[PDB]
């Protein structure tokens, strides 16, 4: 009658989970960083997942990029990076 009512439809993340994360993956003397997501681990295996929704994927060279060696990154861990070739 004298104003406006906005119905805001928003996305609220829910049902979080513990995960072990690392800044980068050390493989063949190279440091791999996720292109779009984050490295996580359920306890035994390492995956790369997107940000606001848990979707674990195999860490490959397509979803990661290489920058330098493993000497400078603090918290880097060893894990294998799959090469689809």
């Amino acid at each position: 009658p004298h104003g406006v009512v906005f119905l805001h439809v928003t996305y609220v993340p829910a049902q979080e989970k513990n995960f072990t994360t690392a800044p980068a993956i050390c493989h063949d003397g190279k440091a791999h960083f996720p292109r779009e997501g984050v490295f996580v681990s359920n306890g035994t295996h390492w995956f790369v997942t997107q940000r606001n929704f848990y979707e674990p994927q195999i860490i490959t060279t397509d979803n990661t990029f290489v920058s330098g060696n493993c000497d400078v990154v603090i918290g880097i861990v060893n894990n294998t990076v799959y090469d689809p070739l």
Binding site: V12, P13, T21, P23, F33, V72, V73, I74
Partner: protein
């Protein structure tokens, strides 16, 4: 007949709110502002903010110590400037002086 009414929220409660905001933004980044607080290592969060400004994560991860040192030096300089500037809080002082 002129009196001053105390504010509803004390300085202690405002400080507690500020400390809660600080803890949330330090331990969870921007997640606690949009929903549940999701814990995250702080260097990873700063790499996130580097991504937001268009800088890759490796730039941060190869210069983490330098970035931390620069941040600490900037915080110290801010404290020193606020302590030494003759008129730094001029807006709040002007509001109080106008009311008085």
């Amino acid at each position: 007949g002129l009196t001053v009414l105390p504010p509803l929220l004390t300085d202690e409660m405002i400080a507690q709110y500020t400390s809660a905001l600080l803890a949330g933004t330090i331990t969870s980044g921007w997640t606690f502002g949009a929903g549940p607080a999701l814990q995250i290592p702080f260097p990873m969060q700063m790499a996130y903010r580097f991504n937001g400004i268009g800088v890759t994560q490796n730039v941060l991860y190869e210069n983490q110590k330098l970035i931390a040192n620069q941040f600490n030096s900037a915080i110290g300089k801010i404290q020193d400037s606020l302590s030494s500037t003759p008129s730094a809080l001029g807006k709040l002082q002007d509001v109080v002086n106008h009311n008085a």
